[PDB]
């Protein structure tokens, strides 16, 4: 086993806007919808329609880490997602909820691949594994006589960062840190080719319908064109200074739209390189791009960056820029990017992506104050606290929102007097409190099993909407819920199955 930890997230109940960057994008032409895969763990649905003050439709919240890739399939009915939490999740795309979680990957799941004709999806990641998924089987709610087997490709010698298939599902390729592309035929699961060429990692793959020709975007800076039939690189395009992360192609397979670390997006005629249209200079590095495919002159392109806003840039004109201002902009929110823990081990200072500064109470699980763009290191010294308290929690900023994590090894290290905590403690004179215990009790307050024949710790409550997460240390997530919903019956049942013994002792048995 691994140790199981308890986490919570300091956030508003609904986070309309991405609170970190966005790694992937999908368009439903039919419904005029854009899916963004968050690095704030959240997948979102937007309408791509005229002058709506909120293009916001909905948040799909299940993942506990970056959502790295999303595929849309079965006529926009189902969404498949890959995450750094090591799970592939299956969603009803119309309703916006999670049908299944796949747990076959043992590391970050980095990429997805879609063969539209076969309704086939593939996942790959850092564990050097590739699994093949029949989507109709994944979404069938019927009882099946077939035992639900999986098939895996094998071959990669290190971590996989990009993956692609053709419409037919004739061929599949992966880009890994081992520089080669590797090629399989899905339906056979057999290796056809290994392609040598790139000198660095490759994060972007596209194929033509036929599975005869491939484009690959690399951190070495080169775009490449391949003949699968000839098993050889046939062209190599040096359009960027730094790595290429994102490629789109036109319907015809003649122009490539490329993006990367150097913030500059270029349409580029494959047949003759020299003609290159510098579309735009984005404010941050380009992670992924999605072509609007209404027209054969593809009208616009949607671009995902390390920033939380998403832009559509028009292609209406077709080495200064075509465009200088976003055709359409989806609002972003701020990521918290710096965290300092004071010596009292109760207060946090943060600086966010908008250089804003805030003061937070970890124990009471809430913002104390907004300080609006002061000098941050000064502020740390300005609020210095001459106390020794041992460390009892860690902070995680991977999603852009504050995630506090409690682990057995030191959850209970911190013993503090009630007056020093600043609690009324009106009766008589005050005692030793253990901050870990008090917080766990606040988190699991609504859980019926805590109550003894009074509720919680008594001294305070968390925001009732505070999500609480149980998960293995750098491993899979066992369960998540909102603090207030632990009073539900199904929720209580899951709490019995997942809350580990060490938490039980304090919260229900009422030990130290």
């Amino acid at each position: 086993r691994r140790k199981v930890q308890v986490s919570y997230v300091i956030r508003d109940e609904v986070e309309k806007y991405n609170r970190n960057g966005v790694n992937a994008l999908q368009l439903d032409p039919a419904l005029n919808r854009l899916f963004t895969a968050g690095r704030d763990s959240i997948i979102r649905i937007w309408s791509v329609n005229q002058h709506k003050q909120d293009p916001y439709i909905a948040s799909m919240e299940h993942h506990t880490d970056w959502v790295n890739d999303i595929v849309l399939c079965c006529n926009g009915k189902t969404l498949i997602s890959a995450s750094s939490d090591t799970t592939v999740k299956v969603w009803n795309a119309h309703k916006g909820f999670c049908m299944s979680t796949l747990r076959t990957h043992k590391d970050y799941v980095k990429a997805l691949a879609y063969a539209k004709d076969k309704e086939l999806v593939a996942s790959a990641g850092l564990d050097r594994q590739i699994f093949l998924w029949d989507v109709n089987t994944l979404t069938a709610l019927t009882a099946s006589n077939n035992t639900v087997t999986t098939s895996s490709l094998s071959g990669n010698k290190d971590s996989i960062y990009s993956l692609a298939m053709n419409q037919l599902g004739t061929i599949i390729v992966s880009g890994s840190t081992e520089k080669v592309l590797r090629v399989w035929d899905p339906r056979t699961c057999a290796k056809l080719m290994k392609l040598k060429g790139h000198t660095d990692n490759v994060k972007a793959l596209l194929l033509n319908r036929d599975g005869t020709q491939c484009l690959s975007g690399s951190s070495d800076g080169t775009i490449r064109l391949w003949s699968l039939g000839q098993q050889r690189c046939i062209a190599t395009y040096r359009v960027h200074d730094e790595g290429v992360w994102a490629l789109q192609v036109n319907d015809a397979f003649t122009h490539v739209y490329s993006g990367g670390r150097d913030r500059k997006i270029y349409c580029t005629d494959l047949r003759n390189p020299d003609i290159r249209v510098l579309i735009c200079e984005e404010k941050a590095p380009v992670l992924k791009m999605e072509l609007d495919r209404s027209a054969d002159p593809p009208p616009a392109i949607w671009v995902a960056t390390t920033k939380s806003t998403v832009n559509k840039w028009t292609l209406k004109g077709i080495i200064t820029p075509l465009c200088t201002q976003p055709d359409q902009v989806i609002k972003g929110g701020a990521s918290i990017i710096q965290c300092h823990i004071f010596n009292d081990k109760r207060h946090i200072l943060t600086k966010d992506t908008n250089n804003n500064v805030a003061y937070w109470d970890v124990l009471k699980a809430c913002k104390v104050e907004d300080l609006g763009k002061v000098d941050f290191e000064d502020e740390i010294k300005k609020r210095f606290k001459m106390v020794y308290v041992p460390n009892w929690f860690s902070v995680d900023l991977k999603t852009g929102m504050l995630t506090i994590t409690l682990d057995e090894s030191d959850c209970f290290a911190a013993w503090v007097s009630a007056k020093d905590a600043g609690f009324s403690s009106p009766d008589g004179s005050d005692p030793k409190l253990n901050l870990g215990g008090l917080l766990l009790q606040a988190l699991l307050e609504y859980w019926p099993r805590t109550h003894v024949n009074q509720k919680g710790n008594g001294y305070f409550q968390v925001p009732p909407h505070t999500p609480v997460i149980f998960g293995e240390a750098g491993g899979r997530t066992l369960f998540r819920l909102l603090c207030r919903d632990s009073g539900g019956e199904t929720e209580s049942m899951l709490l019995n199955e997942t809350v580990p013994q060490w938490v039980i002792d304090i919260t229900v048995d009422k030990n130290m």
């Binding site: 850092l126 840190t177 951190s219 670390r261 852009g400």
Partner: protein, 319 residues
């Protein structure tokens, strides 16, 4: 010419004697030790003792003989509880203690006058590494510079020391459970990590990591692999500076550890003086031809059985 003197073993002090002989046959180190005069004439330290011992060998009347280093050993034992016994110790740990202890003494002398300058220990032995860590999502490079007095290099079977140095400076991928916390990405990601020599030392001390811990069986073994060391060694940096360095080094001393295991054994230094080779085994001094040096590469076969094997190599920058 010169003096060739063995050192008496007192209990189990070969870890110490072997290292003294290496260091005495590092001319630059020897000369600076002979030249040492204290800023405060008053008080006796590990350096004054090394200095008295070295004068004694250097100003001895006959060409060959034996010194008992009573007074250095006594001072060693007084300074360091780890060596205050008759138990066998590790030569490399002593070399590190010694050099740093001297360096600390000389640094105090500099400060003493004024009532972050480098001592001649650092001058002779210090090099510098640049460690680069490339985050694989964001593709940022983070560079940190770290000084060293020696390189402790891992070994593998039937290779040269030059291959080991290559191994040391190769790009490793931090992944799986060793992911890099990247401040850009605010998350753990895979990383490319490389340590490259940024600045070469006048004398390159190599420490061969001849140990393997068995996690299952709760103890470690001694690696007696063949690891070959050439008499001349060529090192370099790649581009990025006013000056590119491509330097020959000559082998001047090997501290050899004899035995089949890590917890006990014997130490002997081989050294080069005036282009031929001597072997010092405490009091015994014996001259050997250059080919005899290959016994100390280690065993091709019967690896479990008893070996005599290079452990610390001193390479001197050609001059």
């Amino acid at each position: 010419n010169e003096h060739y003197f063995g050192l008496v073993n007192f209990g189990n002090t070969c870890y110490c004697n072997s290292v003294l002989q290496a260091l005495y046959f590092c001319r630059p180190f020897r000369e600076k030790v002979l030249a040492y005069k204290s800023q405060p004439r008053k008080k006796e330290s590990l350096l004054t003792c090394l200095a008295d011992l070295f004068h004694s060998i250097a100003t001895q009347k006959k060409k060959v003989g034996v010194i008992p280093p009573k007074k250095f050993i006594t001072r060693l034992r007084k300074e360091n509880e780890l060596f205050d016994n008759y138990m066998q110790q590790d030569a490399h740990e002593f070399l590190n203690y010694l050099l740093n202890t001297i360096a600390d003494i000389l640094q105090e002398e500099r400060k003493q006058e004024k009532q972050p300058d480098p001592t001649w220990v650092h001058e002779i032995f210090q090099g510098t590494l640049t460690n680069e860590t490339r985050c694989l999502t964001c593709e940022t490079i983070s560079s940190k510079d770290e000084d060293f007095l020696d390189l402790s290099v891992d070994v593998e079977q039937n290779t040269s020391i030059t291959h080991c140095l290559r191994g040391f400076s190769n790009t490793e991928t931090l992944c799986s459970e060793y992911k890099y916390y990247c401040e850009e990405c605010r998350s753990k990601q895979e990383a490319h990590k490389r340590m490259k020599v940024k600045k070469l030392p006048m004398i390159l001390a190599l420490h061969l990591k001849r140990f393997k811990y068995m996690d299952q069986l709760h103890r470690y073994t001694k690696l007696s692999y063949r690891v070959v060391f050439p008499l001349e060694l060529r090192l370099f940096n790649t581009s990025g500076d006013a000056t590119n360095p491509d330097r020959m080094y000559d082998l001047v001393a090997v501290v050899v550890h004899c035995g089949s295991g890590p917890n006990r054994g014997h130490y002997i230094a081989i050294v080069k003086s005036h282009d031929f080779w001597l072997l010092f085994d405490d009091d015994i001094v014996e001259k050997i031809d250059a080919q005899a040096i290959e016994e100390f590469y280690g065993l091709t076969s019967d690896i479990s059985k008893n070996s005599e094997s290079g452990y610390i190599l001193f390479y001197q920058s050609r001059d």
